Amino acid sequence: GKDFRTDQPQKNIPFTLKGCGALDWGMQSRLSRIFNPKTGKTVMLAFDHGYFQGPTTGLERIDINIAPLFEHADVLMCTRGILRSVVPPATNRPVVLRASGANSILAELSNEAVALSMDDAVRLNSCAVAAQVYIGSEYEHQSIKNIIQLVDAGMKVGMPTMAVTGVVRDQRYFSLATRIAAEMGAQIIKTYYVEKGFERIVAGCPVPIVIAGGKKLPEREALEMCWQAIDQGASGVDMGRNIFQSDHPVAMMKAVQAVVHHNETADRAYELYLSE
Amino acid sequence: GKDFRTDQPQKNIPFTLKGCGALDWGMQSRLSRIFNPKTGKTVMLAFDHGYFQGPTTGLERIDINIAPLFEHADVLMCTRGILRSVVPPATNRPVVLRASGANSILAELSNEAVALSMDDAVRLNSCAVAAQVYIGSEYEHQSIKNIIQLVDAGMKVGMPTMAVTGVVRDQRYFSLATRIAAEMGAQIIKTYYVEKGFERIVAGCPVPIVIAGGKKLPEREALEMCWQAIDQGASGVDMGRNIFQSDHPVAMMKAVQAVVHHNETADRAYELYLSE
Amino acid sequence: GKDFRTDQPQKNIPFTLKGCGALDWGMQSRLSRIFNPKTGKTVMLAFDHGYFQGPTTGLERIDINIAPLFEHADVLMCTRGILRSVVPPATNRPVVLRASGANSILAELSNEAVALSMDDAVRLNSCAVAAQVYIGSEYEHQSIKNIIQLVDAGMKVGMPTMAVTGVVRDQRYFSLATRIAAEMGAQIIKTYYVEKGFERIVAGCPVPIVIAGGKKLPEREALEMCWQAIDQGASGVDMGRNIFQSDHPVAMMKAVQAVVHHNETADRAYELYLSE
Amino acid sequence: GKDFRTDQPQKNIPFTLKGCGALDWGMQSRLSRIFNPKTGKTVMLAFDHGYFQGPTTGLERIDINIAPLFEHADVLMCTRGILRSVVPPATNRPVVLRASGANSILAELSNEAVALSMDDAVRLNSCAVAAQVYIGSEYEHQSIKNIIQLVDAGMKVGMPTMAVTGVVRDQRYFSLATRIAAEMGAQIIKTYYVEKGFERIVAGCPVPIVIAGGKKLPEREALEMCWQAIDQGASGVDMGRNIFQSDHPVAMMKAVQAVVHHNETADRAYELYLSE
Ligand SMILES: O=C[C@H](O)[C@H](O)[C@H](O)COP(=O)(O)O
Ligand SMILES: O=C[C@H](O)[C@H](O)[C@H](O)COP(=O)(O)O
Ligand SMILES: O=C[C@H](O)[C@H](O)[C@H](O)COP(=O)(O)O
Ligand SMILES: O=C[C@H](O)[C@H](O)[C@H](O)COP(=O)(O)O
């Protein structure tokens, strides 16, 4: 009384996330916590800014101000320090750990080193680790070695690496920076939206691209930037300031979600925002 | 223009999952993928039976028969062989890996060894690893050593261990087996429901208890068993046969979820079942 | 304006704890958490019985029944499983970890293996690790290798090992067991009190000896036993049953303390007991 | 005849020490030796100044001058050289080890490297390790890397790291330095008290803050500084000069204790001081 269904042969189910179709199960599994498999996109809440800036505006009290936002994000991005101290583990939300540092606003910005061992990233149950690359800066070379080192250690263990292009802010520059990062082995690339040519940044990059929010904009313009980036091929957005510095952060996030996951237009999204 | 809210002191948020209030963030984060933080409970779909039994009834074709069930479970439990081969990583569901084996139905049941390295559990992004303890059996000693080994390795890396009490099936026996396992350091205990005294099994165990389904019962009796176990303090149920051997598995899961998470009565749950 | 006090030469302060005068700082510091430096003695509350016995009488609920006792003890002894789950780290009391197991009441008693790595002992901030030696039993050989292995690992790390003589219960037997253990390198020995010859067990053993409580006695007889052991040169007592199975455990501990640290007579101690 | 108390469910006891609610048992246990669990505060006696200064005033003879003070402190802070040579292990007091060095008063101050391996901190049974961060200095980068390194190694082992903000001495500067250090993962931060805005330093830092004494003040002014820091949210004080350079060091410590643990006013405390 057993049924092997020998008339229906077993068939592999393809993994579609851009450029991640030849990774081991664990790594694909981690990537699937970050990018929703249905939509292939992500809404990321970043609040790691303190790692070289100290208590920056809006992030003075993560425990009070930012904690109510966690549930509305797909994925959290922050440092192990903030994570252990004030992000309740019961939050049950994927985390990308900031894994570079040792710079500050008082010195050369690009002077970064790896700021956590893979050992501890694993211990914290990260989905990914993140480092800045600074093409064109004084410490460009070290910043790439940082990526190299994370990818080397990450491959032993199934942990994806995210390279973030730290900084002329034009297409040919980001194309350079994103492509080198990808070519060194980063599975995720975070960069900035650009008025013209962003399409080419995405096209020339073989792995998922996520955009950073940049400085605080009026809510409707920020939603336009999201709309454009998504429309032009970005795999998600990672806002900070544009969310945590808004007067209605929860509403903003709902709007961003509509744009990113549900193909909402910039306008409808803004009206969704206004209704909270 | 910064607000530190110095009139409101920072306060730690308690972690309430039974017996897991003193573990590191990463370990508490993995336990929070398994036990829903709101309810403190879990519905787990087990299908590792193949590890010593071969193609058992209902599990001849995981890829066809079981795959549509994944989305309805809180957590999956299986071996690394099934995981890589036929569980699509896009499933985006927590997994507990079977980490013991090297026995079969053709020999002494209790003759198990560790069947995967922690190295690989981490590579697969597990939430926990599971092994059998066989108190009272010929290879009792080795079976405990297996737990000791996994706990040792798991603590280096933030990986919870689940001890499963393999097998007179009464309260004093299970009290013995569960308590030894917990005492040796397992963070989760899986055991069987018992007609009388189950409350004591729960009370005498300092960490979360999940019950196994056992042999196929009529759906309404299975739901009674769940209800009783939950009512008497179990932190979750881990059915296999009672789900994948039912004629309406998806319906049975929804029913089990109502009992486990939503305080439904056995009867209401059965009616919920009947409406699919 | 500096004063080097060149007229008064620096002088080393001797460490007096029996046979521990040639250990490194860290190991001596850990031993000093256990044995009060003023008196050279310890009151230890043991509740690791579960490790091979399951929920034993008095230890069904450590969290309710035993937790109120912690503050009255010098040092706690238990398993890592109990420690992480139900001993609040805020207790701020030195712990000795049970580091052997994989035996049970349903099989050969002496069949023990090392039950925690030194790695995790250090992670838990233990003061010492304990294992049973079973001279005369079936698995005598393995049990001494257990001690050997912990002492080897403990010397790398400054962790003291306590050997426990598990079981004819006479002087010549305990002299054999305690001396072998010490000769292998254990820094602390736990054994049983004996009607006659106990003085010789102490004299023939070059390191501190602590006595186990044994089965429940009437409070006054238990206090006599302590009195005798301390009088005859024991460095402390480690009661379990005689404390946690008493009707007035807190009172019993205060009595035990008076005998052990303050040279109270058996009688006075019993009256001290009666006044709570 | 067993009582499981099935009518009273097990309940986790919360750990309240600011921002240390998600750490493993051993790390919480080490932190509880430092910060009294009742009050959440600490009085720390620091005498590590020798590490880059040689025999500084008051510390010419630790063995004579400082030894009688140990018993009145909650926790000792010094180097491993001092600890092994002249701190008697029988002192039975928690120690925080200075773990940075290789600078001196004859060269650039911020040129520090890690001065002891975690291996040896464990060997010494420390409760924490400490190192200087020098935001804004020439070797700022290396100094952060030192913290990173200690946290990485500390996490493997359950050892908390204390970052000390070495040095314009205003709020916005210490906010930067404390927050970066916390963000990199230090569990304890030691900084200086500031005339204005100290409240904000505390609020913006997600982990415990302890203040350094600074240069010798008249006893009553020193007690005012304590009172203010504690009142504004500091978790403790770590005096050196203000204690060991006073004419009545034991009296001063009792006064500091009254301020720190018992809510004494600056005035009462000074009168308490005067009465020895
Ligand atoms: O160095 C990167 C930034 O500080 C943030 O972590 C993020 O990547 C971009 O900033 P925002 O989210 O505010 O736009
Ligand atoms: O050895 C354990 C079993 O094979 C299953 O993995 C499970 O733990 C219990 O069986 P069932 O879910 O069918 O009740
Ligand atoms: O195997 C040793 C025992 O179980 C206890 O840990 C203790 O060493 C002696 O027992 P009791 O304290 O009850 O006398
Ligand atoms: O570099 C730090 C100092 O030398 C001391 O160790 C301490 O942290 C602060 O100095 P004081 O206790 O004298 O105020």
Side-chain angles (χ1 to χ4, degrees):
Chain A
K2 290 187 181 169
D3 190 31
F4 292 81
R5 317 227 25 202
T6 62
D7 63 341
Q8 192 176 340
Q10 174 180 324
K11 197 184 167 162
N12 296 339
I13 284 164
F15 192 71
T16 60
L17 181 64
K18 178 181 181 181
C20 302
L23 300 177
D24 182 64
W25 194 98
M27 194 170 292
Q28 298 181 323
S29 164
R30 284 187 180 99
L31 288 163
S32 299
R33 293 202 65 197
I34 294 170
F35 303 91
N36 176 293
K38 315 290 181 188
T39 73
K41 297 154 194 318
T42 197
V43 178
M44 184 174 318
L45 182 61
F47 49 104
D48 56 321
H49 312 241
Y51 85 86
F52 72 103
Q53 299 176 43
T56 191
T57 304
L59 302 175
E60 307 92 333
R61 296 293 300 271
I62 307 280
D63 62 307
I64 294 168
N65 215 60
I66 309 300
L69 312 177
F70 295 151
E71 70 189 289
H72 304 286
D74 288 339
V75 28
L76 307 184
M77 166 148 183
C78 67
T79 60
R80 72 168 157 194
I82 287 307
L83 193 68
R84 281 197 227 249
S85 61
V86 295
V87 174
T91 303
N92 193 16
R93 221 44 78 153
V95 314
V96 174
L97 283 180
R98 157 66 54 185
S100 60
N103 55 336
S104 83
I105 54 174
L106 300 188
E108 166 57 34
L109 197 81
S110 72
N111 199 13
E112 282 192 7
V114 173
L116 64 63
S117 65
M118 192 54 67
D119 180 60
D120 203 30
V122 170
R123 189 175 293 103
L124 291 168
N125 185 37
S126 329
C127 294
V129 291
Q132 305 287 115
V133 64
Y134 290 102
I135 306 301
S137 289
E138 189 182 356
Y139 295 98
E140 171 187 297
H141 182 76
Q142 185 56 59
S143 77
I144 298 173
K145 294 186 64 198
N146 291 344
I147 292 308
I148 284 160
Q149 189 187 311
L150 292 163
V151 174
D152 275 352
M155 288 299 170
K156 299 203 220 292
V157 127
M159 184 75 62
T161 303
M162 176 171 82
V164 186
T165 61
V167 204
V168 58
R169 299 160 142 269
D170 71 341
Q171 173 268 315
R172 66 175 319 201
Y173 173 77
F174 289 127
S175 268
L176 181 62
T178 48
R179 177 61 168 263
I180 291 181
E183 197 104 23
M184 291 309 159
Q187 286 80 17
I188 310 172
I189 303 284
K190 187 206 266 187
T191 188
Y192 291 94
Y193 179 71
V194 158
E195 297 309 342
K196 59 152 306 168
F198 187 74
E199 307 206 317
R200 292 143 80 89
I201 297 169
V202 173
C205 179
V207 295
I209 287 199
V210 166
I211 60 144
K215 54 149 192 190
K216 179 64 162 80
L217 298 171
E219 280 75 15
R220 199 181 43 64
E221 286 172 31
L223 295 172
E224 251 286 313
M225 187 192 186
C226 289
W227 191 92
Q228 290 302 325
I230 299 301
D231 185 62
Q232 288 167 61
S235 299
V237 318
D238 176 342
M239 259 151 195
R241 299 191 212 85
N242 274 296
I243 287 165
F244 61 72
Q245 279 176 5
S246 158
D247 282 327
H248 313 270
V250 173
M252 184 54 177
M253 295 183 75
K254 294 177 181 297
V256 174
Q257 285 208 302
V259 174
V260 167
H261 290 294
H262 309 312
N263 278 320
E264 267 309 354
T265 62
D267 288 337
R268 291 276 169 72
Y270 192 68
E271 290 157 31
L272 201 272
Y273 168 71
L274 290 171
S275 45
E276 294 94 337
Chain B
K2 291 189 179 167
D3 188 30
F4 290 82
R5 314 227 28 203
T6 60
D7 62 341
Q8 194 180 337
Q10 176 178 324
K11 200 181 165 163
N12 294 348
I13 287 163
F15 193 70
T16 63
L17 184 58
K18 184 184 180 178
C20 308
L23 308 166
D24 181 63
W25 196 98
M27 194 162 298
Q28 301 185 318
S29 164
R30 286 183 179 99
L31 290 166
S32 294
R33 289 198 74 200
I34 296 172
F35 302 90
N36 172 293
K38 315 284 181 191
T39 72
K41 297 155 192 317
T42 195
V43 177
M44 180 172 323
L45 178 62
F47 52 102
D48 58 322
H49 314 242
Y51 86 83
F52 71 108
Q53 297 175 44
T56 187
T57 303
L59 303 173
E60 308 90 339
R61 297 292 303 268
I62 308 286
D63 60 309
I64 295 169
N65 215 63
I66 306 300
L69 306 177
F70 296 154
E71 77 187 288
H72 302 289
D74 286 339
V75 29
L76 309 187
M77 162 149 177
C78 67
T79 65
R80 67 172 163 186
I82 289 310
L83 193 67
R84 284 198 220 256
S85 63
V86 294
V87 177
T91 301
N92 194 25
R93 218 50 66 156
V95 320
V96 173
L97 287 178
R98 158 68 50 183
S100 60
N103 57 333
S104 78
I105 52 177
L106 299 191
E108 166 60 32
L109 197 77
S110 75
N111 197 14
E112 282 191 9
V114 172
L116 69 57
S117 68
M118 189 56 69
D119 180 59
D120 211 29
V122 169
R123 189 173 293 103
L124 296 163
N125 189 38
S126 323
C127 294
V129 294
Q132 306 288 112
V133 65
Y134 289 101
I135 307 297
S137 290
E138 187 186 359
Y139 296 99
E140 177 183 294
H141 186 76
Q142 187 53 60
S143 73
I144 301 170
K145 288 183 69 193
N146 297 345
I147 298 300
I148 284 160
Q149 191 179 317
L150 292 167
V151 179
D152 283 345
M155 291 300 169
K156 299 202 218 291
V157 129
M159 184 74 62
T161 298
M162 176 170 83
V164 182
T165 62
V167 206
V168 59
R169 296 159 142 271
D170 71 343
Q171 174 269 316
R172 71 176 317 202
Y173 172 80
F174 287 126
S175 269
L176 176 72
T178 51
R179 177 61 170 262
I180 290 181
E183 198 93 34
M184 291 307 157
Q187 282 83 22
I188 309 172
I189 306 286
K190 190 207 263 188
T191 191
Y192 292 94
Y193 177 73
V194 158
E195 295 309 343
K196 59 150 305 163
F198 188 74
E199 311 203 313
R200 292 147 80 88
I201 299 170
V202 173
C205 179
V207 300
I209 285 202
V210 162
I211 57 140
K215 53 151 192 190
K216 180 61 164 84
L217 297 173
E219 279 76 13
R220 200 183 43 65
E221 288 171 30
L223 294 174
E224 251 290 314
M225 191 191 186
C226 288
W227 188 92
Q228 291 303 323
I230 300 305
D231 187 64
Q232 288 169 60
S235 301
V237 321
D238 177 341
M239 262 145 195
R241 298 193 213 84
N242 278 293
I243 287 167
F244 61 71
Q245 281 176 1
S246 160
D247 283 328
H248 313 273
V250 172
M252 183 51 169
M253 295 189 76
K254 292 172 183 304
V256 171
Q257 286 205 302
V259 172
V260 163
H261 294 290
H262 308 305
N263 278 324
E264 268 311 352
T265 64
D267 292 336
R268 292 279 171 71
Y270 191 64
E271 287 156 30
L272 202 274
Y273 168 70
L274 289 171
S275 47
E276 297 91 335
Chain C
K2 290 186 179 166
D3 189 33
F4 290 83
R5 315 232 25 206
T6 62
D7 60 340
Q8 192 178 340
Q10 175 177 323
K11 200 179 163 164
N12 293 344
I13 288 164
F15 194 76
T16 63
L17 183 60
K18 180 183 178 185
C20 301
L23 298 175
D24 180 65
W25 200 95
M27 198 169 284
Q28 290 182 325
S29 161
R30 281 181 186 99
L31 290 162
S32 295
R33 289 199 70 200
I34 293 170
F35 302 95
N36 177 290
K38 317 284 183 193
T39 70
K41 296 155 194 319
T42 199
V43 176
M44 181 174 323
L45 174 68
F47 53 106
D48 57 323
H49 314 241
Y51 85 83
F52 72 103
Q53 296 176 46
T56 191
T57 304
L59 302 177
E60 308 90 342
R61 298 292 300 270
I62 306 279
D63 65 306
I64 295 169
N65 217 62
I66 308 300
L69 310 177
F70 294 150
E71 74 186 291
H72 301 289
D74 290 337
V75 33
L76 308 189
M77 166 150 176
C78 63
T79 61
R80 70 169 158 195
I82 289 306
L83 191 70
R84 284 197 219 257
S85 61
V86 292
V87 178
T91 305
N92 197 23
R93 217 50 70 162
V95 319
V96 172
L97 285 176
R98 161 64 58 186
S100 62
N103 55 329
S104 87
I105 57 173
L106 302 189
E108 167 56 38
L109 194 81
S110 73
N111 199 16
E112 277 185 17
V114 175
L116 66 62
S117 62
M118 192 54 72
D119 178 61
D120 208 31
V122 167
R123 184 171 302 101
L124 290 165
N125 188 38
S126 318
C127 293
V129 296
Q132 304 289 113
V133 67
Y134 289 101
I135 307 302
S137 291
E138 193 183 351
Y139 296 101
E140 174 186 299
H141 181 74
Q142 184 53 56
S143 77
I144 301 166
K145 287 179 66 191
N146 292 345
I147 292 306
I148 288 160
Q149 183 185 319
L150 293 160
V151 175
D152 279 348
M155 290 298 168
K156 295 203 221 295
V157 134
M159 184 78 58
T161 302
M162 171 165 88
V164 181
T165 68
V167 208
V168 63
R169 300 159 138 270
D170 73 343
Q171 176 266 312
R172 63 175 319 200
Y173 171 81
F174 288 123
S175 266
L176 177 72
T178 50
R179 177 60 168 263
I180 292 181
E183 197 99 33
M184 291 310 156
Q187 287 80 20
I188 311 170
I189 307 289
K190 187 210 264 185
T191 192
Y192 291 93
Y193 178 74
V194 158
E195 295 310 340
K196 58 152 307 167
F198 188 74
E199 308 203 313
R200 291 144 83 86
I201 299 167
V202 172
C205 181
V207 296
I209 287 196
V210 162
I211 60 142
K215 53 150 192 187
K216 182 61 163 78
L217 299 173
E219 280 76 12
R220 197 181 44 64
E221 286 170 31
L223 297 174
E224 250 289 310
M225 184 188 186
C226 296
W227 190 92
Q228 293 300 328
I230 298 303
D231 188 62
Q232 291 168 59
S235 299
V237 319
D238 176 342
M239 258 148 199
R241 295 189 214 88
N242 278 292
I243 286 164
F244 61 72
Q245 280 178 359
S246 159
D247 282 326
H248 314 270
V250 172
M252 183 50 167
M253 294 183 76
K254 294 176 181 303
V256 172
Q257 284 209 305
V259 173
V260 167
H261 291 295
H262 307 306
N263 280 322
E264 266 307 354
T265 65
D267 289 336
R268 291 279 168 70
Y270 191 68
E271 286 155 32
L272 200 276
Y273 168 70
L274 290 169
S275 47
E276 296 95 335
Chain D
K2 291 187 180 169
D3 188 33
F4 290 84
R5 312 230 26 203
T6 61
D7 61 341
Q8 189 180 340
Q10 178 177 322
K11 198 179 166 163
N12 295 345
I13 287 160
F15 195 71
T16 61
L17 183 59
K18 180 184 183 180
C20 313
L23 300 173
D24 183 65
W25 198 96
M27 195 169 289
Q28 294 180 325
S29 165
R30 286 188 178 92
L31 291 167
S32 295
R33 287 197 72 198
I34 293 171
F35 304 91
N36 177 290
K38 313 285 180 193
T39 71
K41 294 155 193 319
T42 195
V43 177
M44 182 171 324
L45 177 63
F47 50 104
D48 58 320
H49 314 241
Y51 81 87
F52 69 105
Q53 292 181 50
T56 189
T57 305
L59 301 176
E60 309 90 341
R61 297 293 301 270
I62 306 285
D63 61 310
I64 294 169
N65 215 67
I66 309 298
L69 309 175
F70 294 154
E71 74 189 289
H72 303 288
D74 288 337
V75 26
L76 311 182
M77 167 151 178
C78 65
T79 63
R80 67 173 164 188
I82 290 310
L83 191 69
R84 277 196 228 258
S85 67
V86 295
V87 180
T91 303
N92 192 21
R93 219 48 71 157
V95 318
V96 170
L97 286 173
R98 162 63 54 183
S100 62
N103 52 341
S104 80
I105 56 178
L106 296 188
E108 166 60 37
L109 193 82
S110 72
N111 200 18
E112 275 188 18
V114 176
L116 67 57
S117 65
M118 190 57 64
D119 179 68
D120 202 34
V122 167
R123 188 173 292 105
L124 287 169
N125 191 32
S126 326
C127 294
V129 291
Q132 302 291 112
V133 63
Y134 291 100
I135 304 304
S137 285
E138 188 184 355
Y139 296 98
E140 169 185 301
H141 184 71
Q142 187 51 66
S143 72
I144 303 176
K145 291 185 65 190
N146 293 348
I147 293 306
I148 279 157
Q149 180 186 323
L150 285 168
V151 180
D152 281 350
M155 291 298 172
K156 295 202 226 292
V157 131
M159 183 77 58
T161 298
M162 182 168 84
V164 184
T165 62
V167 209
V168 62
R169 302 165 131 270
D170 72 338
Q171 174 267 312
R172 69 172 316 201
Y173 173 81
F174 290 124
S175 275
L176 179 71
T178 49
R179 180 68 165 258
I180 295 182
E183 199 96 35
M184 294 307 153
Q187 283 79 20
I188 312 173
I189 309 285
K190 187 208 263 184
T191 190
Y192 292 94
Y193 178 73
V194 158
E195 293 311 339
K196 59 154 306 165
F198 188 75
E199 304 207 315
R200 290 147 83 86
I201 295 174
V202 169
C205 178
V207 294
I209 290 203
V210 159
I211 63 144
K215 53 149 192 191
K216 179 66 167 77
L217 297 175
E219 280 73 12
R220 198 185 39 70
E221 282 174 34
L223 296 172
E224 251 288 311
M225 186 191 191
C226 293
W227 189 89
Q228 290 302 324
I230 297 307
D231 186 63
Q232 289 170 57
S235 298
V237 319
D238 176 342
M239 262 152 195
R241 300 190 211 86
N242 279 293
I243 286 164
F244 62 73
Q245 281 179 2
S246 156
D247 280 329
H248 313 272
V250 174
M252 178 56 168
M253 292 185 77
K254 291 174 188 298
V256 174
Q257 287 206 302
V259 172
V260 166
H261 294 292
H262 305 308
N263 277 323
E264 264 312 351
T265 64
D267 290 338
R268 293 277 169 71
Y270 190 68
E271 288 157 30
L272 201 276
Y273 168 70
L274 287 170
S275 47
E276 298 94 332

